[PDB]
Amino acid sequence: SSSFSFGGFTFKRTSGSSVKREEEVLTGNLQTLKIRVHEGYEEFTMVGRRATAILRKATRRLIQLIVSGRDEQSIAEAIIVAMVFSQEDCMIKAVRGDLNFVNRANQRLNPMHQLLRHFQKDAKVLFQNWGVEPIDNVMGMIGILPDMTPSIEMSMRGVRISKM
Numbered sequence: 144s145s146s147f148s149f150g151g152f153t154f155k156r157t158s159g160s161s162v163k164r165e166e167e168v169l170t171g172n173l174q175t176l177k178i179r180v181h182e183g184y185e186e187f188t189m190v191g192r193r194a195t196a197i198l199r200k201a202t203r204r205l206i207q208l209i210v211s212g213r214d215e216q217s218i219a220e221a222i223i224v225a226m227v228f229s230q231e232d233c234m235i236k237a238v239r240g241d242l243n244f245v246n247r248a249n250q251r252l253n254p255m256h257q258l259l260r261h262f263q264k265d266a267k268v269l270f271q272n273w274g275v276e277p278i279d280n281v282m283g284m285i286g287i288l289p290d291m292t293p294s295i296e297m298s299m300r301g302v303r304i305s306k307m
């Protein structure tokens with residue numbers, strides 16, 4: 144529809160629709176965020192300077208993410224953005240460390256951007272917590288594990304790389 148930018152990716156909805164509802168979620172380090180949850184199945188393109196992805200998702204669920212990109216960092220960047228954008232519970236529960244989401248004064252930062260900045264610091268716990276699954280052998284596609292190494296047999300749940 145209208146595109147928007149998030150995490151350095153231009154998102155464009157290419158299919159589906161959603162309604163929104165506010166939910167007060169509880170992070171892994173026991174902070175509350177009031178997030179606008181998108182309810183319904185949707186597909187988006189994500190266009191970055193250094194990676195591209197196609198995301199299928201539903202309410203707080205990433206169903207498929209196909210990514211291409213120039214190097215390990217740029218592919219990881221896309222996966223982190225997509226995992227945050229999915230609003231999944233395992234992502235909310237993967238938050239660690241300082242209680243730095245609490246508003247300091249009258250700031251009212253955007254919770255989705257708060258989450259993104261947290262996981263851009265270090266996505267190791269996010270990726271470890273996300274889940275891995277066996278994959279089918281689809282020529283041209285490969286899996287990617289939580290330590291960012293490729294695998295032809297297993298991948299982070301829902302995620303596949305289209306090999307350059």
